């Protein structure tokens, strides 16, 4: 509800320090912070999620199950929020890919706990029919 954008020169230093490709020289720029904040608005997702380490990671979860059938737009976001999430969790990524393989390790910390509960609560299969 405040002035446009939230990050500043300080954070911009790290945001621009991240490379877009694994073996390339391209990096992230404001162009993305704007495109993302806007994209989410179209994905029924509020841009106010980029202002929280827990908010970003959460966003990825929504597209996680959509990665199988996600357009070029959804795919971008996933790779985007993944780069920002590290910016708020105090993580230095070498590139887009590096970030992914990075956040995946952070989830394992919670998976170990979710398993203790899964032993009691489990999911079932799905199936429908049409004439
Ligand atoms: C008030 O209406 C709250 C919403 C304003 C916050 C939007 C700022 C988005 C922050 C950009 C994230 C940086 C992407 C790397």
What report would you give on this structure?
The protein has about 130 residues and is mainly alpha-helical. It has one domain: DNA polymerase, domain 1. It contains five helices and no strands. Helix 3 packs antiparallel against helix 4 (about 70-90) and helix 4 (about 70-90) packs across helix 5 (about 95-120). The protein is globular and about 55 Å long. The chain binds myristic acid.
**C-alpha end-to-end distance:** 51 Å
Attached small molecules = myristic acid
Measured as a percent range, the helix fraction is 40-55%
Q: So what's the overall shape?
A: globular
CATH architecture: Orthogonal Bundle
- What name goes with the CATH superfamily? Immunodeficiency lentiviruses, gag gene matrix protein p17
Please report the total strand number as a whole number: 0
- Remind me, CATH topology? DNA polymerase, domain 1
Number of helices: 5
Structural class of the helices, strands and pairings? Answer: mainly alpha
Helix and strand sequence: HHHHH
> Using only CA atoms, what is the Rg?
17 Å
Biggest sheet, in brief?
none
- What is the CATH level 1 assignment? Mainly Alpha
Question: What's the structural domain tally?
Answer: 1
| Percent range for β-strand residues | under 5%
Organism: Human immunodeficiency virus type 1 (HIV-1)
Protein name: Gag polyprotein
Subcellular location: Host cell membrane; Host endosome, Host multivesicular body; Virion membrane; Virion
Region (Disordered): 105-127
């Amino acid at each position: 509800g405040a002035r446009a954008s939230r990050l500043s020169g300080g954070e911009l230093d790290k945001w621009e320090k991240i490379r877009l490709r694994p073996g390339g020289k391209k990096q992230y720029k404001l162009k993305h912070i704007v495109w993302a904040s806007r994209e989410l608005e179209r994905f029924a997702v509020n841009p106010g999620l980029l202002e929280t380490s827990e908010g970003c990671r959460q966003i990825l979860g929504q597209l996680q199950p959509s990665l199988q059938t996600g357009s070029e737009e959804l795919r971008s976001l996933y790779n985007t929020i993944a780069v920002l999430y590290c910016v708020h969790q105090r993580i230095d990524v070498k590139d887009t890919k590096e970030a992914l393989d990075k956040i995946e390790e952070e989830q394992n910390k919670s998976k170990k706990k979710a398993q203790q509960a899964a032993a009691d609560t489990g999911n079932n299969s799905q199936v429908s029919q049409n004439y």
